[PDB]
């Protein structure tokens, strides 16, 4: 006999919704990536995406410990020699509060074409309303 | 000034992807003689829009 392997043409993917108000950033992103990949399923397969779709609400109300709200810095480079730019946690929550959650989850997911696809199943919103009622998402206490 | 490695036959075909030719779309037909000719050009016999331009 051989070992079972999933097939991307017959795998099931459900929808969920989560609230991020008052939740810890790092300890939340950890469980999202765990489900976007499929580790919570017995049919897990490294070369196949067996994850679920997840919606996140109230991204602008996550919490951080210590003085990270003012001392945590996000660096990035453009390509020119001037280059290096930076921004703080508070500055990002006011300009684009959705990047904080995405940047944290993108680092916990594997690299390559497959990891870039799991990220496409993550819908982040900065409010309390969404326009995906047709998919009938379920609540996920997490 | 000169290469360090030998290019492949694959890279050679890519460079020649824009070297193809183009054929004439269509030929115009004269009103009187009924011959095929290039648009805005005279025919071999010497006709152009039915006026019997140069014959020799």
């Amino acid at each position: 006999m051989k070992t079972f392997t999933a097939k991307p043409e017959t795998v099931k993917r459900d929808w969920y919704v989560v609230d991020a108000t008052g939740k810890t950033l790092g300890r939340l992103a950890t469980e999202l990536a765990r489900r976007l990949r499929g580790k919570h399923k017995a049919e897990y397969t490294p070369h196949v995406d067996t994850g679920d779709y997840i919606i996140v609400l109230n991204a602008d109300k996550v919490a951080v410990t210590g003085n990270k709200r003012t001392d945590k810095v996000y660096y990035h480079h453009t390509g020119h020699i001037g280059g290096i730019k930076q921004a703080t946690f508070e500055e990002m929550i006011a300009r684009r509060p959705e990047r904080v959650i995405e940047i944290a989850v993108k680092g916990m997911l594997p690299k390559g074409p497959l990891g870039r696809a799991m990220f496409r199943k993550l819908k982040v919103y900065a409010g309390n309303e969404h326009n995906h009622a047709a998919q009938q998402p379920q609540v996920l206490d997490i | 000034a000169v290469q360090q490695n030998k290019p492949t036959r694959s890279k050679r075909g890519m460079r020649r992807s824009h070297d193809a030719l183009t054929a004439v779309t269509s030929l115009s037909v004269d009103k009187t003689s009924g011959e095929k000719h290039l648009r805005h050009h005279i025919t071999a016999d010497g006709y152009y829009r039915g006026r019997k331009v140069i014959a020799k």
């Binding site: - | 070297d19 030719l21 054929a23 004439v24 030929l27």
Partner: protein
């Protein structure tokens, strides 16, 4: 039925003749002759003579009609190269290659 025609040991490189052969592959005989007539290239003259020969062979030998013929297969292969000498500066000498080609055309009634 398929009729053949060839022109071996032609004075031209295969790379130059292939540019023209790609314009008539799979076309009708009547349409192909018009294309080559208004193509400004030396290779177009050689190919035309070969195509005309095949058309004549079909009628005389295979007893076919012109209106039903089509170019089904056409390709160009490399032929023998002639070696020549070219003097350069400071006593150095280079080699020159005059390349040839084999042309082949196939017409069919299908």
């Amino acid at each position: 039925m398929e009729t053949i025609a060839k022109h071996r040991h032609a004075r031209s490189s295969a790379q130059k003749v292939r540019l023209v052969a790609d314009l008539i592959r799979g076309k009708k005989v009547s349409q192909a002759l018009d294309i080559l007539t208004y193509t400004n290239k030396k290779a177009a003259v050689l190919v035309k003579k070969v195509l005309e020969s095949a058309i004549a062979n079909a009628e005389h030998n295979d007893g076919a009609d012109i209106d039903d013929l089509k170019v089904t297969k056409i390709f160009v292969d490399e032929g023998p190269s002639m070696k020549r000498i070219m003097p350069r500066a400071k006593g150095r000498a280079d080699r020159i290659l005059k390349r040839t080609s084999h042309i082949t055309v196939v017409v069919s009634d299908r």
